[PDB]
Design a protein around this ligand. Structure first.
Ligand SMILES: [Ca+2]
Ligand SMILES: [Ca+2]
Ligand SMILES: [Ca+2]
Ligand code: NA
Ligand code: NA
Ligand SMILES: [Zn+2]
Lengths: 87, 316
């Protein structure tokens, strides 16, 4: 079942993505590449959810959004790694 | 040979302080000392650490409570922490509680459930549903001991929509009064924690289909056997703020909240830095001060100081 999630850059920009809970993290980076041109190998995705419950997790390729219990309108944190600097 | 639990931890250049607080959480230490963990180790968990954080922790605790040592050098445990959390400073307790939980999570194949808002349903019904959904994916000794439930109320400033959810927690981070006060009761920080706050970090309103600086109000709905309370004294470098050294007066005995009554069992202290701990030893009932390898007797009257950073409370 397809759902809307958001990806926020360090710039404060929100990227809206249509995803499936079964989508792999690699699929999510592919969708980020489509919207923003950033190559997947340069993307780091963090899921903090709401803070006081679970410790923030670096989303690992091969895992699915389901593994991290990502929900409709959850927000992922995007870190672009370009030439050894985070953006 | 020494009294079990009266065991320091060598400095290896928050970790020792956090271990001493967890070491002196009796139901956690008893679970490991009674070998209840081996059958619950979770090796495949996508969110876990292959069982290695809980294994390394259990072996450390067995050493600290064997009575054979006055202090141990926790190199093996620090190695596993470095392997799964290379970023390690004051967030280590959150990492450990989460890591212990997933390494011991009894749910070996987790279902995915689409969580939902209250949608006008009664608090009791939505909360029971939230906790049932939590336990479908999270069932461990750490849930048993530490996890509670918030009521979260978000209110969109533009359309005035109210969105209520019930959300699990495994510790509380309490704000202190700003501007800085010299003295505040812990009850006042709890009241501040449950006070409405406009988000700076906006929230997506599903009605406006925009991200809005809604107001968020937290309420304590369900409380755990052991409540971990973090006092928010610090701030990121950019704010250029001195650490708040307010005297937060917290109860040694009989902290009352939401109908439960709590007694202090450990305190992590931070000196602006260096961390130490006070803890109550479960076998003689006395208070002790843990400063890395050194363990010494303490008195209750020493415990409330401006250095108190994390408080561990056990339900009466
Ligand atoms: Ca674009
Ligand atoms: Ca009492
Ligand atoms: Ca109670
Ligand atoms: Na992990
Ligand atoms: Na109080
Ligand atoms: Zn709205």
């Amino acid at each position: 079942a397809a759902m809307l999630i958001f990806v926020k850059t360090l710039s404060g920009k929100f990227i809206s993505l249509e995803v499936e809970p079964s989508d792999t993290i690699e699929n999510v980076k592919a969708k980020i590449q489509d919207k923003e041109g950033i190559p997947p190998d340069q993307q780091r995705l963090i899921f903090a959810g709401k803070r006081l419950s679970f410790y923030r997790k670096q989303l690992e390729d091969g895992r699915t959004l389901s593994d991290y219990n990502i929900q409709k309108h959850s927000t992922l944190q995007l870190l672009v790694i370009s030439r050894g600097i985070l953006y | 040979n020494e009294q079990p639990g009266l065991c320091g931890l060598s400095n290896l250049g928050f970790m020792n302080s956090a271990i001493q607080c967890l070491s002196n959480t009796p139901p956690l230490t008893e679970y490991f000392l009674n070998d209840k963990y081996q059958e619950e180790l979770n090796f495949d968990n996508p969110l876990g650490m292959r069982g290695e954080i809980a294994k390394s922790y259990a072996e450390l605790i067995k050493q600290m409570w064997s009575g054979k040592f006055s202090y141990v050098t926790p190199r093996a445990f620090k190695t596993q922490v470095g392997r799964f959390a290379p970023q390690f400073c004051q967030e280590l307790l959150a990492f450990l509680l989460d890591g212990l939980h997933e390494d011991l999570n009894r749910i070996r194949k987790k279902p995915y459930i689409q969580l939902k808002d209250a949608d006008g349903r009664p608090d009791k019904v939505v909360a029971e549903e939230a906790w049932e959904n939590h336990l479908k994916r999270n069932d461990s000794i750490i849930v048993d001991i530490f996890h509670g439930l918030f009521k979260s109320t978000l209110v969109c400033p533009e359309c005035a929509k109210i969105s209520v959810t019930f959300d699990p927690f495994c510790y509380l981070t309490l704000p202190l009064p700003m501007p800085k006060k010299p003295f505040v009761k812990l009850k006042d920080c709890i009241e501040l924690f449950t006070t409405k706050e406009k988000l700076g970090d906006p929230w997506y309103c599903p009605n406006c289909k925009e991200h809005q600086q809604a107001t968020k109000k937290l309420d304590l709905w369900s409380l755990p056997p052991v409540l971990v309370v973090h006092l928010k004294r610090f701030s990121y470098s950019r704010y250029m703020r001195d650490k708040l050294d307010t005297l937060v007066d917290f109860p040694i005995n009989d902290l009352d909240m939401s109908g439960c009554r709590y007694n202090l069992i450990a305190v992590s202290n931070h000196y602006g830095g260096h961390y130490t701990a006070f803890a109550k030893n479960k076998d003689d009932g006395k208070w002790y001060y843990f400063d890395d390898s050194s363990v010494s007797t303490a008195s209750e009257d020493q415990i409330v100081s401006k250095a108190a950073y994390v408080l561990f409370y056990q339900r009466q």
